[model samples]
Target: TVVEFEELRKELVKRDSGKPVEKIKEEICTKSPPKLIKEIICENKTYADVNIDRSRGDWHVILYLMKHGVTDPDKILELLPRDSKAKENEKWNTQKYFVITLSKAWSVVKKYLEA
Candidate 1:
């Protein structure tokens, strides 16, 4: 993980409340990023969805990346829920959520992206 839990949380909260993406990135770098990927995954799941299982660490990483506009459908698919429902239902795919959230974030930070 390249961001701290607090930083990530701040970013998410800011995003949820219509803050700019640059603002979120600024918040994300305020604290030291996690030293390991697992730490990042743990922090992300806890921050994003407390109900998430620790075993699904990879999904968390993918979710975090997608949230940052680093979209890659194949990569995102690899981290999705394994159940048949998830595969059949577009809503259950983490990538779709990520895209929606990312678009919202971008709207808040439109100036930054446009510049």
Candidate 2:
């Protein structure tokens, strides 16, 4: 699925044949950890919501990273399991499990922090 950005400046600059400094900066900034985390948690709720089907959980993880402005899908893949079947089927399979687990953890944290 095409990830939507608030604006298209970075994408436009990236597609340019000429290497531009600003484009590189945009790329670098987009992949920062905080941005990636926000994307996963906020922008891509369809994928990030743990209540969804196990077969497609990883999609949320991908969405989370994209929403946070992280463009490196490969890095997210690295954190995921190599076995496609395991990734798609196993209820607790792959890094997707970890993402959901972390979300739960954050929920707990929020409870404590708010209390």
Candidate 3:
């Protein structure tokens, strides 16, 4: 499996695309991103209800990308979360280990909505 991961990594390095990172972030919030993020990033009763309209920068996007293994954040740094007032690490905390919590992610990321 490690070898397979290495191969995949080789395939992903130094690749450039025209896709805008903002569009990718918007798709995640508005159209459901990767499975891992959708599973833990939803606040509503169902993942299908997750939504983050084109309302500008959202911190949740950064965290989800972090979870997705994004290395370079400079692409969106100018728009990254800077406001300390935004909600963060509520439903689940990834500060050390992946654990469930009651904290909200941000105006964008939904808290873990497990009953």
Q: TM-score for each prediction?
A: 0.28, 0.29, 0.27
Among all candidates shown, the one with the greatest lDDT = 1
Clashing pairs in 1: none
Residues 16-71 of candidate 3 have per-residue lDDT tens digits of 23346555555456765665455423433222334433222244444455334332
Candidate 1: C-alpha RMSD to true structure equals 12.8
Q: How do the candidates rank by TM-score, highest first?
A: 2, 1, 3
Candidate 1 per-residue lDDT, tens place, 34-100, comes to 6443444333332235444533443445445545554333333433444423344645664344445
- Give the runs in model 3 whose Cα sits over 4 Å from its true position: 1-18, 32-61, 69-71, 82-115
lDDT-wise, the better of 2 and 3 is 2
Clash-forming residue pairs, model 3? 90-103, 90-104, 91-103
lDDT of 2 by residue, 1-115 (tens): 1222212324422323353333533554455455433343334243334454533565545444343343342344344434444345656554444344434433443355353
lDDT for each candidate structure:
0.43, 0.41, 0.35
User: Candidate 1, 34: how far from true, in Å?
Assistant: 4.4
Q: Candidate 2, after superposition: displacement of residue 113 in Å?
A: 30
